[PDB]
């Protein structure tokens, strides 16, 4: 016994909300899509193939679950999770005098069973030297202490740590490097007098 | 106790239902652990035995059973500088390395004494 | 090159965690043997070939259980059956050369 059921197109309402049939990423089932779309290279006397049995419409990633109405309806319920950014830091001129420490953190995503990316341990530290309590001798010693990690044009010290396995460990180690580089710059030893 | 599990399976039988939405599919797969933890972080599930940076970078506390002024220090400071910049090895895995050196040098005593330099 | 710069670099290497005392380039190799993973430990080296035996035994057991249909093995069995019916089959181990 063979049965051939007509698709939902004959039953799809003209005013029915679209996000109800495509909530998440779907494989673009032609029975649930009421739009007649012809995809494929046409024949000299023919037309592009219809949506039924069309592998071309199945190879491409469909955005039927990300229409403007669905994204507006999604973010209207997502407005409750975020917080409001303080307007006291609208310009970076105040952000440099309030939060001079910058931590560049990298994150990656890839399709597959594994998540470990060896580029995730990299944590970059950027501090402007014009915002510290360095004296003349402490600064002139810290410059030669860091070397090429500190630039003279922009006057920004950069710390590039990759030795620790974990990102939190590389962050704590970069802050530890900042603490020791600020502290040991004030200690004047006996070999400095020569 | 078996009776609490037998009572929990009756709660699971009524709470479980066929999936009606792909959102509930990913909710259930995320609570079970199939879906990734969004937003995804490349260190999810790996804590490295809860160690910190002072367990990886600073390895001088393990060189106490070695001669301080001999060439053993000149040689082992290099393996410790390597283990400090080795992010692929754990704080436990570096320990059997330094212990393998501690065992080999303390096992081969005749060559270190016939080499002319004193080592303990 | 002055003593002040040698001492500054020696203390910078101490604070950053590099080699403190001057060592030769030939001896710097042992630092590299430990700073990176060896070749025989890499996932791209020791996990190069997948376990072909797992795939083969799984698919063959599934074919014997009746879920997978291996047309290649079925063709091999068809040709082997027709060869044994023709009369040139596989001799027994221990009687090919002598018997």
């Amino acid at each position: 016994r063979r049965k051939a059921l007509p698709p939902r197109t004959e039953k799809m309402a003209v005013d029915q909300d679209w996000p109800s049939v495509y909530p998440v990423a779907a494989p673009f089932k032609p029975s649930a899509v009421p739009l007649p779309v012809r995809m494929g290279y046409p024949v000299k006397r023919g037309v592009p193939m219809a949506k039924e049995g069309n592998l071309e419409l199945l190879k491409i990633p469909n955005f039927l679950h990300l229409t403007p109405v669905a994204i507006k309806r999604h973010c209207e319920a997502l407005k409750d999770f975020c917080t409001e950014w303080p307007a006291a830091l609208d310009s970076d001129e105040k952000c440099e005098k309030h939060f001079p420490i910058e931590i560049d953190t990298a994150d990656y995503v890839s399709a597959g069973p594994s998540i470990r990316n060896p580029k995730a341990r990299v944590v970059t530290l950027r501090v402007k030297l014009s915002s510290l309590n360095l004296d003349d001798h402490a600064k002139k010693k810290l410059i030669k202490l860091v070397g090429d990690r500190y630039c003279k044009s922009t006057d920004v010290l950069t710390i590039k740590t990759d030795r620790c396995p974990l990102k939190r460990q590389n962050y704590d180690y970069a802050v530890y490097l900042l603490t020791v580089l600020y502290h040991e710059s004030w200690k004047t030893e006996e070999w400095e007098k020569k | 106790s078996l009776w609490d599990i037998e009572f929990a399976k009756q709660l699971a039988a009524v709470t479980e239902r066929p999936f009606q939405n792909g959102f509930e599919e990913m909710i259930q797969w995320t609570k079970e652990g199939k879906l990734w933890e969004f937003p995804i972080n490349n260190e999810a599930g790996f804590d490295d035995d809860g160690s910190e940076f002072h367990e990886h970078i600073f390895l001088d506390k393990y060189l106490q059973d070695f001669p301080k002024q001999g060439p053993i220090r000149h040689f082992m400071e290099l393996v410790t500088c390597g283990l400090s910049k080795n992010p692929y090895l754990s704080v436990k895995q570096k320990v059997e390395h330094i212990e393998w050196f501690r065992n080999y040098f303390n096992e081969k005593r005749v060559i270190l004494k016939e080499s002319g330099i004193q080592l303990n | 090159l002055s003593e002040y710069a040698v001492r500054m670099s020696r203390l910078s290497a101490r604070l950053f965690g590099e080699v403190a005392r001057p060592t030769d380039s030939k001896s710097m190799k042992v630092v590299k043997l430990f700073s990176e993973q060896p070749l025989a430990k890499r996932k791209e080296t020791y996990d190069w070939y997948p376990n072909h035996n797992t795939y083969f035994a799984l698919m063959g057991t599934l074919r014997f259980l009746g879920l997978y249909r291996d047309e290649h093995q079925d063709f091999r069995d068809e040709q082997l059956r027709l060869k044994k019916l023709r009369g040139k089959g596989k001799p027994r181990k221990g009687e090919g050369k002598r018997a």
Partner: peptide
């Protein structure tokens, strides 16, 4: 030649690096 004394344990106890 001459070697300088580096305070490692002191800096560790100071900056929580022990």
């Amino acid at each position: 030649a001459a070697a300088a004394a580096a305070a490692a344990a002191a800096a560790a106890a100071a900056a929580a690096a022990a």
